[PDB]
Tab-separated table of C-alpha atoms in Angstrom:
chain	number	residue	atom	x	y	z
A	5	UNK	CA	-13.138	23.763	-31.656
A	6	UNK	CA	-15.350	22.633	-28.686
A	7	UNK	CA	-13.553	21.013	-25.647
A	8	UNK	CA	-15.139	17.656	-26.754
A	9	UNK	CA	-12.691	17.540	-29.719
A	10	UNK	CA	-9.649	18.893	-27.804
A	11	UNK	CA	-6.602	16.511	-28.085
A	12	UNK	CA	-6.475	13.469	-25.706
A	13	UNK	CA	-3.164	14.442	-23.972
A	14	UNK	CA	-0.577	11.814	-23.226
A	15	UNK	CA	2.084	12.139	-20.519
A	16	UNK	CA	4.979	14.627	-20.711
A	17	UNK	CA	7.923	13.261	-22.863
A	18	UNK	CA	9.546	11.916	-19.607
A	19	UNK	CA	6.353	9.803	-18.977
A	20	UNK	CA	4.651	11.790	-16.165
A	21	UNK	CA	1.204	13.490	-16.270
A	22	UNK	CA	1.843	16.902	-14.624
A	23	UNK	CA	-0.899	18.066	-12.271
A	24	UNK	CA	-1.180	20.919	-9.765
A	25	UNK	CA	-1.783	20.456	-6.011
A	26	UNK	CA	-5.437	21.578	-6.616
A	27	UNK	CA	-6.046	19.475	-9.758
A	28	UNK	CA	-4.746	16.471	-7.696
A	29	UNK	CA	-7.159	17.249	-4.802
A	30	UNK	CA	-10.044	16.899	-7.404
A	31	UNK	CA	-8.547	13.822	-9.196
A	32	UNK	CA	-11.297	11.341	-10.169
A	33	UNK	CA	-9.860	7.836	-9.604
A	34	UNK	CA	-11.719	4.536	-10.067
A	35	UNK	CA	-10.792	1.137	-8.630
A	36	UNK	CA	-9.504	-1.325	-11.282
A	37	UNK	CA	-8.076	-4.284	-9.317
A	38	UNK	CA	-7.075	-5.464	-5.868
A	39	UNK	CA	-5.609	-8.741	-4.658
A	40	UNK	CA	-3.889	-10.435	-1.762
A	41	UNK	CA	-0.058	-10.789	-1.570
A	42	UNK	CA	0.793	-13.566	1.061
A	43	UNK	CA	4.527	-12.914	0.513
A	44	UNK	CA	4.064	-9.192	1.436
A	45	UNK	CA	1.840	-10.221	4.420
A	46	UNK	CA	4.610	-12.495	5.845
A	47	UNK	CA	7.149	-9.761	5.048
A	48	UNK	CA	5.222	-7.080	7.112
A	49	UNK	CA	4.637	-9.562	10.004
A	50	UNK	CA	8.445	-10.172	10.008
A	51	UNK	CA	8.926	-6.401	10.483
A	52	UNK	CA	6.585	-6.364	13.589
A	53	UNK	CA	3.472	-5.110	11.707
A	54	UNK	CA	0.321	-6.851	13.093
A	55	UNK	CA	-1.450	-7.210	9.695
A	56	UNK	CA	-4.460	-9.460	9.025
A	57	UNK	CA	-4.161	-9.116	5.202
A	58	UNK	CA	-1.829	-7.440	2.716
A	59	UNK	CA	-1.971	-6.856	-0.996
A	60	UNK	CA	-1.962	-4.649	-4.045
A	61	UNK	CA	-4.530	-2.294	-5.569
A	62	UNK	CA	-4.659	-0.550	-8.988
A	63	UNK	CA	-6.740	2.606	-9.696
A	64	UNK	CA	-7.063	4.780	-12.798
A	65	UNK	CA	-8.592	7.899	-14.371
A	66	UNK	CA	-9.725	7.149	-17.898
A	67	UNK	CA	-8.505	9.314	-20.833
A	68	UNK	CA	-10.733	11.902	-22.571
A	69	UNK	CA	-10.480	15.261	-24.360
A	70	UNK	CA	-7.958	17.408	-22.428
A	71	UNK	CA	-7.838	14.633	-19.730
A	72	UNK	CA	-4.776	12.341	-19.641
A	73	UNK	CA	-4.894	8.668	-18.546
A	74	UNK	CA	-3.754	8.463	-14.903
A	75	UNK	CA	-2.624	5.187	-13.067
A	76	UNK	CA	-2.182	4.946	-9.308
A	77	UNK	CA	-1.252	1.755	-7.503
A	78	UNK	CA	-0.012	0.864	-4.063
A	79	UNK	CA	0.479	-1.895	-1.489
A	80	UNK	CA	-1.873	-1.984	1.491
A	81	UNK	CA	-2.342	-3.921	4.720
A	82	UNK	CA	-5.290	-4.426	6.971
A	83	UNK	CA	-4.444	-3.912	10.691
A	84	UNK	CA	-5.658	-6.640	13.026
A	85	UNK	CA	-6.231	-4.289	16.045
A	86	UNK	CA	-8.234	-1.473	14.479
A	87	UNK	CA	-9.534	-2.997	11.243
A	88	UNK	CA	-7.972	-0.003	9.487
A	89	UNK	CA	-6.568	-0.204	5.928
A	90	UNK	CA	-3.104	1.326	5.573
A	91	UNK	CA	-0.971	2.391	2.553
A	92	UNK	CA	2.244	0.460	3.227
A	93	UNK	CA	5.077	3.017	3.803
A	94	UNK	CA	2.812	5.729	2.322
A	95	UNK	CA	4.390	4.562	-0.998
A	96	UNK	CA	2.234	5.233	-4.051
A	97	UNK	CA	3.197	4.258	-7.591
A	98	UNK	CA	1.727	6.384	-10.426
A	99	UNK	CA	2.346	8.137	-13.770
A	100	UNK	CA	1.862	11.499	-12.004
A	101	UNK	CA	4.330	14.275	-11.194
A	102	UNK	CA	2.896	16.982	-8.935
A	103	UNK	CA	3.927	20.519	-9.847
A	104	UNK	CA	3.875	23.769	-7.817
A	105	UNK	CA	2.368	27.280	-8.461
A	106	UNK	CA	5.334	28.192	-10.746
A	107	UNK	CA	4.857	24.876	-12.671
A	108	UNK	CA	8.054	23.273	-11.307
A	109	UNK	CA	8.091	19.600	-10.184
A	110	UNK	CA	7.806	18.920	-6.458
A	111	UNK	CA	9.263	15.392	-6.693
A	112	UNK	CA	8.142	11.777	-6.016
A	113	UNK	CA	7.786	12.112	-2.198
A	114	UNK	CA	5.442	15.134	-2.236
A	115	UNK	CA	3.555	13.650	-5.241
A	116	UNK	CA	2.925	10.306	-3.418
A	117	UNK	CA	1.789	12.293	-0.344
A	118	UNK	CA	-0.742	14.368	-2.326
A	119	UNK	CA	-2.044	11.176	-3.986
A	120	UNK	CA	-2.284	9.211	-0.653
A	121	UNK	CA	-4.368	12.216	0.682
A	122	UNK	CA	-6.667	12.226	-2.404
A	123	UNK	CA	-7.052	8.413	-2.021
A	124	UNK	CA	-8.240	8.811	1.620
A	125	UNK	CA	-10.874	11.386	0.458
A	126	UNK	CA	-12.006	8.774	-2.152
A	127	UNK	CA	-12.486	6.188	0.690
A	128	UNK	CA	-10.139	3.800	-1.125
A	129	UNK	CA	-10.511	1.061	1.650
A	130	UNK	CA	-14.247	0.606	0.814
A	131	UNK	CA	-13.547	-0.354	-2.862
A	132	UNK	CA	-10.508	-2.545	-1.991
A	133	UNK	CA	-12.481	-4.631	0.605
A	134	UNK	CA	-15.411	-4.837	-1.831
A	135	UNK	CA	-13.183	-6.222	-4.638
A	136	UNK	CA	-11.525	-8.679	-2.197
A	137	UNK	CA	-14.990	-10.074	-1.388
A	138	UNK	CA	-15.821	-10.282	-5.141
A	139	UNK	CA	-12.843	-12.636	-5.791
A	140	UNK	CA	-14.243	-15.411	-3.525
A	141	UNK	CA	-17.200	-15.765	-6.019
B	5	UNK	CA	-22.405	-34.397	-4.954
B	6	UNK	CA	-21.478	-33.358	-8.566
B	7	UNK	CA	-18.171	-31.380	-9.053
B	8	UNK	CA	-20.370	-28.288	-9.839
B	9	UNK	CA	-21.292	-28.065	-6.111
B	10	UNK	CA	-17.809	-28.961	-4.763
B	11	UNK	CA	-16.489	-26.272	-2.300
B	12	UNK	CA	-14.859	-23.106	-3.800
B	13	UNK	CA	-11.402	-23.604	-2.150
B	14	UNK	CA	-9.566	-20.666	-0.686
B	15	UNK	CA	-5.793	-20.540	-0.175
B	16	UNK	CA	-3.948	-22.695	2.386
B	17	UNK	CA	-4.068	-21.130	5.950
B	18	UNK	CA	-0.660	-19.433	5.209
B	19	UNK	CA	-2.290	-17.658	2.168
B	20	UNK	CA	-0.838	-19.662	-0.769
B	21	UNK	CA	-2.778	-21.740	-3.357
B	22	UNK	CA	-0.706	-24.963	-3.648
B	23	UNK	CA	-0.329	-26.292	-7.183
B	24	UNK	CA	1.820	-29.014	-8.755
B	25	UNK	CA	4.402	-28.413	-11.520
B	26	UNK	CA	1.875	-29.969	-14.005
B	27	UNK	CA	-1.225	-28.125	-12.717
B	28	UNK	CA	0.853	-24.884	-13.091
B	29	UNK	CA	1.814	-25.765	-16.710
B	30	UNK	CA	-2.012	-25.886	-17.463
B	31	UNK	CA	-2.895	-22.765	-15.364
B	32	UNK	CA	-5.581	-20.666	-17.109
B	33	UNK	CA	-4.669	-16.996	-16.500
B	34	UNK	CA	-6.511	-13.956	-17.887
B	35	UNK	CA	-5.196	-10.399	-18.203
B	36	UNK	CA	-6.820	-7.961	-15.719
B	37	UNK	CA	-4.737	-4.756	-15.929
B	38	UNK	CA	-1.526	-3.280	-17.272
B	39	UNK	CA	-0.058	0.203	-17.015
B	40	UNK	CA	3.081	2.239	-17.482
B	41	UNK	CA	5.469	3.029	-14.565
B	42	UNK	CA	7.760	6.027	-15.625
B	43	UNK	CA	9.614	5.766	-12.283
B	44	UNK	CA	10.491	2.074	-13.000
B	45	UNK	CA	11.433	3.012	-16.624
B	46	UNK	CA	13.958	5.658	-15.401
B	47	UNK	CA	15.136	3.184	-12.747
B	48	UNK	CA	15.937	0.425	-15.373
B	49	UNK	CA	17.616	2.984	-17.718
B	50	UNK	CA	19.812	4.015	-14.721
B	51	UNK	CA	20.898	0.354	-14.412
B	52	UNK	CA	21.987	0.229	-18.144
B	53	UNK	CA	18.779	-1.469	-19.423
B	54	UNK	CA	17.817	-0.016	-22.864
B	55	UNK	CA	14.018	-0.048	-22.252
B	56	UNK	CA	11.445	1.810	-24.372
B	57	UNK	CA	8.616	1.289	-21.815
B	58	UNK	CA	8.207	-0.253	-18.367
B	59	UNK	CA	5.230	-1.055	-16.214
B	60	UNK	CA	3.053	-3.414	-14.249
B	61	UNK	CA	0.577	-6.123	-15.247
B	62	UNK	CA	-2.028	-8.060	-13.195
B	63	UNK	CA	-3.475	-11.463	-14.251
B	64	UNK	CA	-5.895	-13.830	-12.520
B	65	UNK	CA	-7.708	-17.183	-12.618
B	66	UNK	CA	-11.275	-16.763	-11.440
B	67	UNK	CA	-12.646	-18.939	-8.582
B	68	UNK	CA	-15.065	-21.853	-9.166
B	69	UNK	CA	-15.964	-25.257	-7.701
B	70	UNK	CA	-12.687	-26.997	-6.733
B	71	UNK	CA	-10.776	-24.079	-8.416
B	72	UNK	CA	-9.143	-21.458	-6.158
B	73	UNK	CA	-8.752	-17.765	-7.116
B	74	UNK	CA	-5.196	-17.231	-8.412
B	75	UNK	CA	-3.429	-13.751	-8.799
B	76	UNK	CA	-0.198	-13.253	-10.722
B	77	UNK	CA	1.436	-9.882	-11.245
B	78	UNK	CA	4.814	-8.667	-12.376
B	79	UNK	CA	6.847	-5.731	-13.688
B	80	UNK	CA	7.815	-5.739	-17.360
B	81	UNK	CA	9.893	-3.690	-19.785
B	82	UNK	CA	9.879	-3.392	-23.517
B	83	UNK	CA	13.404	-3.600	-25.051
B	84	UNK	CA	14.237	-0.898	-27.576
B	85	UNK	CA	16.566	-3.126	-29.717
B	86	UNK	CA	14.444	-6.231	-30.214
B	87	UNK	CA	10.923	-5.046	-29.388
B	88	UNK	CA	10.786	-7.939	-26.919
B	89	UNK	CA	8.761	-7.782	-23.671
B	90	UNK	CA	10.707	-8.933	-20.612
B	91	UNK	CA	9.686	-9.920	-17.036
B	92	UNK	CA	11.917	-7.607	-14.988
B	93	UNK	CA	14.343	-9.794	-12.934
B	94	UNK	CA	12.122	-12.821	-13.696
B	95	UNK	CA	10.283	-11.672	-10.507
B	96	UNK	CA	6.645	-12.750	-10.350
B	97	UNK	CA	4.288	-11.873	-7.507
B	98	UNK	CA	1.394	-14.305	-6.855
B	99	UNK	CA	-0.707	-16.162	-4.251
B	100	UNK	CA	0.789	-19.453	-5.512
B	101	UNK	CA	3.210	-21.886	-3.876
B	102	UNK	CA	4.461	-24.605	-6.227
B	103	UNK	CA	4.742	-28.050	-4.659
B	104	UNK	CA	6.692	-31.167	-5.741
B	105	UNK	CA	5.678	-34.856	-6.357
B	106	UNK	CA	5.720	-35.556	-2.568
B	107	UNK	CA	3.532	-32.427	-1.976
B	108	UNK	CA	6.338	-30.403	-0.339
B	109	UNK	CA	6.844	-26.692	-1.190
B	110	UNK	CA	9.568	-25.841	-3.697
B	111	UNK	CA	9.851	-22.190	-2.592
B	112	UNK	CA	9.320	-18.691	-4.094
B	113	UNK	CA	12.188	-18.851	-6.656
B	114	UNK	CA	11.104	-22.113	-8.332
B	115	UNK	CA	7.423	-21.019	-8.110
B	116	UNK	CA	8.128	-17.670	-9.896
B	117	UNK	CA	10.124	-19.597	-12.541
B	118	UNK	CA	7.274	-22.050	-13.248
B	119	UNK	CA	4.822	-19.121	-13.466
B	120	UNK	CA	7.115	-17.012	-15.772
B	121	UNK	CA	7.278	-20.152	-18.068
B	122	UNK	CA	3.454	-20.592	-18.042
B	123	UNK	CA	3.104	-16.831	-18.792
B	124	UNK	CA	5.345	-17.155	-21.907
B	125	UNK	CA	3.143	-20.069	-23.163
B	126	UNK	CA	0.098	-17.750	-22.641
B	127	UNK	CA	1.789	-15.079	-24.878
B	128	UNK	CA	1.469	-12.549	-22.049
B	129	UNK	CA	3.153	-9.717	-24.168
B	130	UNK	CA	0.217	-9.731	-26.668
B	131	UNK	CA	-2.403	-8.906	-23.951
B	132	UNK	CA	-0.149	-6.343	-22.176
B	133	UNK	CA	0.514	-4.350	-25.428
B	134	UNK	CA	-3.189	-4.608	-26.308
B	135	UNK	CA	-4.258	-3.142	-22.922
B	136	UNK	CA	-1.603	-0.383	-23.206
B	137	UNK	CA	-3.173	0.659	-26.532
B	138	UNK	CA	-6.679	0.563	-24.947
B	139	UNK	CA	-5.692	3.195	-22.315
B	140	UNK	CA	-5.029	5.918	-24.950
B	141	UNK	CA	-8.811	5.799	-25.824
């Protein structure tokens, strides 16, 4: 039938949503939640990182016809010097597995890298700081 | 003035909201977000845990007059055998520091334990499973 009645796909049987390098560069993610982690903040400061704040953030792409539900979360810190928001260790947790041109997996490390790059194009620091201000209300 | 205009308290200067054992047993937490982590799920299965699903969950207590904003998050898994939801390692991440009768800190380990106990009284598995079903829509 019409794409509007196409099945809502779930992940692959192993739990990952498989997306190409290109499909990942156009991934539509929305901010869901952000918060402060004082234990992470002390932890980073102990490892010589000059961080003002540290915390978590959760982002998602809602499910629809031929569009699987995607979750992307990571730890961040706000540098004191520059005021720049940083993805701690470039580590990104998600339900995504990035695949190549032949459709083969490219692994966790290249997947997290492609997602961290899409997140920077989505100006993820603007929505994190915004939510952090919303919590004080 | 009236308690309705009392200051909205923020955390202590070190970033923790200090709450007594009793105040923690009456903590009003609401579910914010839950999602699946297939990387955690494989990770637990690799360590001989028979888990059907694994993921994250984020809970909070909204700020108000004389009421600080509280965040509580943890990793969970759903046991295959029993169908029981489990806090992975009993580890709980929050902006809370539990204090004793003299007002002294009782540390991370006793804080996480008091929060995991409050979470069980709030029937946290019911809201996690509910949100997980909501994502497939």
